[PDB]
Amino acid sequence: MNINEPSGEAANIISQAADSHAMKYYNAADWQAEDNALPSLAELRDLVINQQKSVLFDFSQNSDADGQAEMQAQFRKTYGVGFANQFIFITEHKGELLFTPFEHSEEVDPKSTLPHVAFYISVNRPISDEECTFDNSWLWKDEKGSRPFCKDANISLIYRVNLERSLQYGIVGSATPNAKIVRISLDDDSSGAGIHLNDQLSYRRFGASYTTLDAYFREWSTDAIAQDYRFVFKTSNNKAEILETFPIDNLNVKYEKRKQSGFELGVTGGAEVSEDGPKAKLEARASITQSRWLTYNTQDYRVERNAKNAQTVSFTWNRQEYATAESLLNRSTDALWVDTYPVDVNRISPLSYASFVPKMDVIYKASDTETGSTDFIIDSSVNIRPIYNGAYKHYYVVGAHQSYHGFENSPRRRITKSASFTVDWDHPVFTGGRPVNLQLASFNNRCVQVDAQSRLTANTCDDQQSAQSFIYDQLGRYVSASNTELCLDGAALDVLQTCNQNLTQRWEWRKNTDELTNVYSGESLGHDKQTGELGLYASSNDAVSLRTITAYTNVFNVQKSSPILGYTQGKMNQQSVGQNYRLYVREGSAIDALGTASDLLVGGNGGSLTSVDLSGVKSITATSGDFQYGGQQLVALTFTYQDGRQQMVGSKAHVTNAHEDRFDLPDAAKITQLNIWADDWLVKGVQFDLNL
C-alpha cells in the first residue's frame, strides 16, 4: 500500500537511482493510516533477497517526536533493528538484509541451530575535492595556491551485525556466558570496498620567489596518504559492555595473518542433542562456536587497541614504517645544480593510499534480564596527510651544497563517517529459544496468531510472521515472539496475558501424540474446528479438535534443515539429491525404503516402488503411530505442493494412535541432502537439508 505522496527528496532518490526498475518506495507516515502499509518481514525479504529490489523507506514526512518514535518502533519491531535517519535503503548482501541509512539524496546519487538475527549496515562516504585540498606549499603556504591531494577518495564499508543470546553451558571453569550478545564485525566474507585515497602518488615542485643564500629554496609537496585509519565503537548507555574483541592485543607492522575469531555460545541444541526438537523446553544442551574470518596485512601500520571505558573500544591502524616525510627521503645532500625529486614513494605501501580493507570483531554483552534499548555507534575515519619536503642551501666560502628535509608539523585532515543503529533488548531472539508456532491440526494451514490488542485468532500460517511465533521457555510457558512480556494462558485463551508464575501458563506435551496439556487443570488445548477459538477440554467433542502441531519458524534465521521426521535408529545415511530432483521410495503398509536414486535405496527389500517429485513442494508431513508390527513407527510421508496437490507415500491404515509432524519448506529453497535412518526392514526417520 502507498497512501502518501513521495517527499521531494524521495522523488530525487528514485529518479537518480541507477536501476529505477528495481525501486520500491514506502512512506512511513502511511502506517498511521494503515498498519499493513509497511511490508511484512516475509514481503521485505521476498522483495529484497528473492527479487533483488532496492527498498527505500522514507521517514521525512512528519518530524513529530511522538510520531518519529512510533514509526521507528514499528520498523525496529518488524525488521529487528532501528535507525535515526530520514531515509533507509534496504538491499541484499550475502543472503541477508543490508541497511543503508542516510539523510540526503546526494549521499546515494550514483552520478545452524543458533537462533540469531543477522543483517548488514553499509556506509559510503565519498571524500570531495575540497576535503582533500591542501596548500601547495608548507614553507610558502600563502604564495603557491592549493590543489586536491587525493583523487576519487572514498570510504565504503559494510558492518556485519548479529543479535543473539548465549546460555550458560559447559564444565565448571570453561562454561559459556549467560548474556545477550550484539556482535559487530568487518570480516573477510562480507567486507565492503574499503578506503581509497589515490591510484598513485604525484607531487608538485616549488621554489622560493626570492634570492636565497642560507635558506630553504626548493620544496616538493607529495599527494596525501593515510597517517592513520581509525574505527571507534561506542554505545548510547551502559546497558552493554565490551566482552571480547579481535584484535585483542596490538598488532605489529608487517603482520600477515588470517585470524579465526571464534565466540562460544550455549544453545538449546539441534536435533543431535535435543530429540524432542520444537517440543523441547528452553534449556542449555550444547555449545557452538560462531567464527568470523579476519585477514590482516598491516605492512607499514601497527594496529593499536584502546578501550576508553567498558562501553568503548577503538582500533587505529597507525603509520609506523616510513611514518615521517623525512623518512621518505632517498637523498641527503647534493651540489646546488642538482634538481630532482628527493623522495622515494615506493617506500609507501599501497595500503596507505590505494586500497585498505579493515578487519575486526567486536562482541558486546548485556545482562540476561536487560530491558529497554541501546544505540550502537561506529565512527570510521581516515587521517589524510599531505607530504612536504624541502631543500636548504648552505654556502660556506668557496663551496656550497644543499640538504634535504621533511616537515612533520604540516596540516592533516580527518574525514569521519559515522553510523548508528538501535537494538531492543526485549527482542525475542535474546531469550535464547528457537521460535516455534502452534498449528491447529484440524485445519490444513491454520496457525495461532496474535493481533495488536493481544487477541488470539487462527490465520494462514506464515513462518516469518512474529505474531505466529512463540518461545517454549524453561517453565513450559509459550511466550509470544511479538511481545516477550505476554504468554499463552489457559485461564483466558482469548487474549495473551502477562507472563507470571501461575500454573495455568505452563504447558506439557503428551508423548507420541498431538496433544498439548495445561499444567494447572490437566486439560488439553483444543480449538474450534470452524472458528479456531482456543479452549481447555477434557476430551474432544463435535466442535473441538485436540490436535496441535508445532514446528520451527523462520522469524530470526531461515532454517536450513528440518527436524528429524520420525525416529533415529542405526546409522545415518546421507544421500544427495541429484539433478532429477526426485525421491525414490518403495512403499506398502509403511515406507520400506527411501532414496534419491533408483538404485540407491536404504531400508528393506519389500514394498512397491514409486517416485516423488520435489519440484513445487510446499511442506512435508510425517505420520507416525503404533504399527501393526511393533511400537512407534513412521508410516507415511505426505508431500503438499503449491498448487494444492498432495502425494502420500506409505500408509496410515495399519497404525493406531497416529500423530503428525509438519516441516514447511521456505520459499526459493532447494532440498539437497537427505539423512535417512532405517533398519533391514523399514525406514525409521528422515531429515531434509536445504540451500537458500
Author numbering: 0 to 110, 133 to 713
Quoted passage from the original study:
Vibrio α-hemolysins (αHLs) are β-pore-forming toxins secreted by Vibrio pathogens, crucial for the facilitation of bacterial infections through host cell lysis. These toxins are produced as inactive precursors, requiring proteolytic maturation and membrane association for activation within host tissues. Using X-ray crystallography and cryo-electron microscopy, we decipher both the immature and assembled structures of VcαHL and elucidate the conformational changes corresponding to toxin assembly.
To further explore the mechanism of calcium-mediated stimulation of VcαHL, we determined the crystal structure of pro-VcαHL. Paralleling the structure of pro-VCC, this structure also shows four distinct domains: a pro domain, a cytolysin domain, a β-trefoil lectin domain, and a β-prism lectin domain. In pro-VcαHL, the β-prism lectin domain primarily interacts with the β-trefoil lectin domain, contrasting with its binding to the pre-stem loop in the pro-VCC structure. Several hydrogen bonds and salt bridges were formed between the β-prism and β-trefoil lectin domains, stabilizing the domain interactions in pro-VcαHL. In addition, the pre-stem loop in pro-VcαHL interacts with the β-trefoil lectin and cytolysin domains through several polar interactions. Two lysine residues, K300 and K302, interact with the β-trefoil lectin domain through side-chain associations with T534 and E529, respectively. In pro-VcαHL, H137 forms a hydrogen bond with a sulfate ion that binds to R313 of the pre-stem loop, while E185 participates in interactions with Q311 on the pre-stem loop.
